[PDB]
Amino acid sequence: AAPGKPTIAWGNTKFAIVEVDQAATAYNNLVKVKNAADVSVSWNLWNGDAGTTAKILLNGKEAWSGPSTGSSGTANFKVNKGGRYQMQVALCNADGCTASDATEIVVADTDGSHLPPLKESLLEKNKPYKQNSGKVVGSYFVEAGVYGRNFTVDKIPAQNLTHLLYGFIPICGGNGINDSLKEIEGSFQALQRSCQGREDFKISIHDPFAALQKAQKGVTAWDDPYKGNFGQLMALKQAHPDLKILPSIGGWTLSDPFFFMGDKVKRDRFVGSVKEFLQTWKFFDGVDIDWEFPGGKGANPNLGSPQDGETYVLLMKELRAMLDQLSAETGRKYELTSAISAGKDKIDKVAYNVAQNSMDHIFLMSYDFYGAFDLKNLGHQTALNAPAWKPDTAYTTVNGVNALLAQGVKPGKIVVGTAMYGRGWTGVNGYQNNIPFTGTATGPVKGTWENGIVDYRQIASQFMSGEWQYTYDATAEAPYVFKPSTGDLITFDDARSVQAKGKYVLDKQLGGLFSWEIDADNGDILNSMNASLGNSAGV
C-alpha cells in the first residue's frame, strides 16, 4: 500500500526573501536582498513504511523531491515568491502518496505578500470617502511621528487617500553635506549612524528603528522580519492595492545634498541608490523629490546657485529614465513627483514646463507663506488669495499656480497644498482696523510640539472657545483665531478654506489636493479635501 503518514517536526516556520537585521543601526547591515528564501523542513514517521520518494508540497504544488531513505528526513529548498503557504510532506511509493497534515510557513517579502491586509477602522472625526473623482488626494506621514505624536500607520485614514508620501528618506553625508541637520538635536548623529560605511550621496533610512524595528499593530511578533512603519505600510498596501505610497527624499533639513547634484558623478550615484532602494522595498510606487528650493533660500544660507534649475530638470529626467528602466525589469508602473515652493520667486528658478514631462505630479507647497520665522510681516500662511488689506500679497496659493501655468505647466499636473496645522505668533500688537495681521509680534505662539506650530487638532479642540476670537477671511479664503489679551494669532486651514481650495482645483482643472502632517488632523481637513474634490461618501 501507500507509505505511512509523516509528521512535520518542530522548527522555525518564518522565512524571508529580503532579510532584515532587527538589531542593525547601519543601513548597509540592515537589509540583504536575496533572489529567494531558503526554507527548511524536517519530518518523522512512527507508523507505516517511509515510502521510496519524499516530496514537499506548497499549497499542493511540489517544491522539492528526494529519496526517502529513512523514517525521518530533512529537506532544504528555495521559495522565490512571498506569502503564506500550507506546507506538507508527502511520502510516495509505487502504490501512491500519503501527505502529512498541513503546516503553515511564511515567506516574507517587502511587498507585504506575507501579511494580512491592514484594514483599520477610521478614527476621530474621519468619515469614509470613495476615490472616484479622479483627483489627487494625498498627505505626508512623518517617520518620527510614531514617538511623541504617537501617530502610527494603523491610524492613517488610508481609504481617503490616493497618495501617501513617507516622512523623508535622507541622503547620506556628514560635515559639509548635511549641516542643516545639526540644528536638530541628535538628528545629524542619527544619520551618521545609519550611513556608517555607506557612500555620501546614496540614500538611506534616517531612523532604522522607527522604520523597520519598532513593534506596531500587525507586526508585533518578536521574530517578524519587517516591523515599524515599513512593515505596516506593507500590510497597508495589501489592504489598499491602489494606494500610491511614495518615499519622499529631502524636506527642510535633508535638502543640503541636492545642491551638490550639479556633479554628474554624485547625481548618478544618487539615482542608482534610489533604484536599488525601490528594488529592495517593493511596497513603494516611485519617488518624491522634496528639494527645499533649488537656488537657495532653504535651511542652509551657504547653498544655492543659478545652476540648480538646470540640475533639477536633469535630475527629474534621469530619475524618470531610471524608473522606465525599472519598469522594464518589474513590469510595474512607477510615479515621479516633487514638492515645490509655491513662491513665484522660487518657481521662476526652475523650468517646470520642461520638468513636468518626466513627472506625474507636482505638489505645490501652498502653505507656510507666513510664520514665526518673520515677526514683522504677518499674514495668512496658506490662504488662496490675497487679503483685502493687502491685495498685492505675493505669497498666495493662486500666485503660485499662475506662476506655474504661466511657464506652460499643464494644470492637471498641479496638486494644491492644504495645511493640517496652524502657524502663529504671540504678543501681536500695533495693528490697525482690527486686523492683527497689520501689526508685529514679539515671538512665536506656544506650539503643540514645537514653537510657532500647532496641530489643527489642537486648534479645533482648544482655540475655538474662551477668549479666542474667530474670523473667516472670505476674501483670501482663510480662517484665523486671535486672543487680544496675550496677542496670540494663529493662521491655518479649516473645513471651509479647504472647500475653497477644492472648488478652485475643480474650476481650474488642477491635479488635486495634498496635505502636510496627516497626524495633525482630526479628520475635518481630509474630509473636506475629499468632499470638495467630488469624492462620494462611502459606507
Structure summary:
This protein is α/β, with parallel strands linked by helices and 539 residues long. The protein has twelve helices and 26 strands.
Task: Outline the structure in words.
The protein is α/β, with parallel strands linked by helices. It has three domains: 1-107, Immunoglobulins (Immunoglobulin-like, Sandwich); 108-419 and 496-539, Alpha-Beta Barrel (TIM Barrel); 420-495, Chitinase A, domain 3, CATH 3.10.50. The chain is 22% helix and 24% strand. The protein has twelve helices and 26 strands. It has helices at 27-30, 187-194, 208-213, 228-239, 264-280, 308-330, 344-347, 352-355, 397-407, 456-462, 495-508, 524-532; strands at residues 7-8, 14-16, 18-20, 31-33, 37-44, 53-58, 61-67, 72-79, 83-93, 96-99, 103-108, 136-140, 163-165, 244-246, 248-250, 286-290, 335-341, 361-365, 414-419, 421-426, 443-444, 453-455, 469-473, 478-483, 488-491, 512-516. The strands form five sheets. It has a nine-stranded parallel beta sheet. Strands 2, 6, 7, 9, 10 and 11 form a six-stranded mixed beta sheet that branches. Strands 20, 21, 22, 23, 24 and 25 form a six-stranded antiparallel beta sheet that branches. Strand 16, helix 6 and strand 17 form a beta-alpha-beta unit. It starts with 6 loop residues before the first strand and ends in a 7-residue tail after the last helix. It catalyses: Random endo-hydrolysis of N-acetyl-beta-D-glucosaminide (1->4)-beta-linkages in chitin and chitodextrins. InterPro entries: Chitinase_II/V-like_cat, Chitinase_insertion_sf, ChitinaseA_N, Glyco_hydro18_cat, Glyco_hydro_18_chit_AS, Glycoside_hydrolase_SF, Glycosyl_Hydrlase_18, Ig-like_fold. Residues 135-536 form the GH18 domain. Pfam families: ChitinaseA_N, Glyco_hydro_18.
